[PDB]
Design a protein around this ligand. Structure first.
Ligand SMILES: Nc1ncnc2c1ncn2[C@@H]1O[C@H](COP(=O)(O)OP(=O)(O)OP(=O)(O)O)[C@@H](O)[C@H]1O
Ligand SMILES: [Ca+2]
Ligand SMILES: [Mg+2]
Ligand SMILES: [Mg+2]
Length: 309
């Protein structure tokens, strides 16, 4: 097969990686914490099976994601380390991140501090401006797809729904985070990288309030709501003016009035001076809490400590 010869390494993954532990579950299989035997380094492995009967589509999705991942070379995007094949299962290897921003919201059962939101937002934004400068669109920006890695960098992950070209016209994304002009393709229409700026605004609210607006409504009704109603905003007046302004700019409903990710890189919310260890401290803050969550042996957050086993 042309695609296997071109995109995959020939090694048997079973010989290269060990101590696999599930750290998540995707659409094609679990995602595992693992150690590369060649250097004792921890990695993340997304196993994607293409057996069964949906084999054709499954294989097609795998290759499409691999081709996208290998194009990426930016510090705020998840590092792709290659892929392997073994018995109808493709092993996509990536640098290992200790958790997602949503895992952080789940561990503390509290929104993040504004300075932490600014740091996470800034990382995700740099990653998005990088994709957009190459005519790509992520299309699924949300806290659950933003990963944190030691020492403390924030990276965009999950390129399963990305577009290699803009403008695009596919109904894709996760309802609560979807931009209005993407929903309007449910019928017909086109859009560009600005749909990610909208999703980033919703994600900012999600980090500030633990959930995106409309999370309390079923997905289908939410879609019509997003398309028809005016934009949501941060609920509380206690956040700084810069943060409130960043979110309101991200959530402009008229696409032409919404700024590109490139322009937002210079927004004061993102450029405001903050401690260079904000993320590191957050991670540590989180590790400490995971070790305290009662039932550490039955935790779904205990993975944040897997590399210590
Ligand atoms: N590089 C990584 N390091 C650590 N954990 C990761 C990594 N990539 C993915 N994960 C974990 O695996 C699960 C994610 O992946 P992805 O977002 O890749 O899944 P999907 O295939 O999009 O599945 P879903 O739709 O359920 O999110 C995530 O929720 C995340 O916790
Ligand atoms: Ca199309
Ligand atoms: Mg995902
Ligand atoms: Mg996905």
């Amino acid at each position: 097969d042309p695609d296997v010869a071109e995109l995959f390494f020939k090694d048997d993954p079973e010989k290269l990686f060990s101590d696999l532990r599930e750290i998540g579950h995707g659409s094609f299989g679990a995602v595992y914490f693992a150690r590369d035997v060649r250097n004792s380094e921890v990695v993340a492995i997304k196993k994607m099976s293409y057996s069964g009967k949906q084999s054709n589509e499954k294989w097609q999705d795998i290759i499409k994601e691999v081709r996208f991942l290998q194009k990426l070379r930016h510090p705020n995007t998840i590092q792709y380390r290659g892929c392997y094949l073994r018995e109808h299962t493709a092993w996509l290897v990536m640098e290992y991140c200790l958790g997602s921003a949503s895992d952080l919201l789940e561990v503390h059962k509290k929104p993040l501090q504004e300075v932490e939101i600014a740091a996470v937002t800034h990382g995700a934004l740099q990653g998005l401006a990088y994709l957009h400068s190459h005519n790509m669109i992520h299309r699924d920006v949300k806290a659950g797809n933003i990963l944190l890695s030691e020492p403390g960098l924030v990276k965009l992950g999950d390129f399963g729904s990305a577009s290699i070209m803009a403008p695009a016209n596919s109904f894709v994304g996760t309802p609560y985070w979807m931009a209005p002009e993407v929903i309007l393709a449910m019928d017909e229409g086109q859009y560009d990288g600005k749909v990610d700026v909208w999703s980033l605004g919703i994600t900012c609210i999600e980090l500030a309030e633990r959930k995106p607006p409309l999370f309390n409504m079923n997905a289908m009704s939410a879609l019509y709501h997003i398309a028809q109603n005016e934009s949501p905003a941060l609920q509380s007046g206690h956040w700084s003016e810069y943060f409130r302004n960043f979110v309101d700019s991200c959530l402009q409903k008229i696409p032409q009035d919404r700024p590109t990710s490139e322009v937002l890189l210079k927004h004061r919310f993102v450029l405001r001076e903050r401690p260079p260890t904000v993320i590191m401290d957050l991670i540590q803050r989180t590790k400490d809490a995971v070790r305290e969550l009662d039932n550490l042996q039955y935790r779904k957050m205990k993975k944040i400590l897997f590399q210590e086993a």
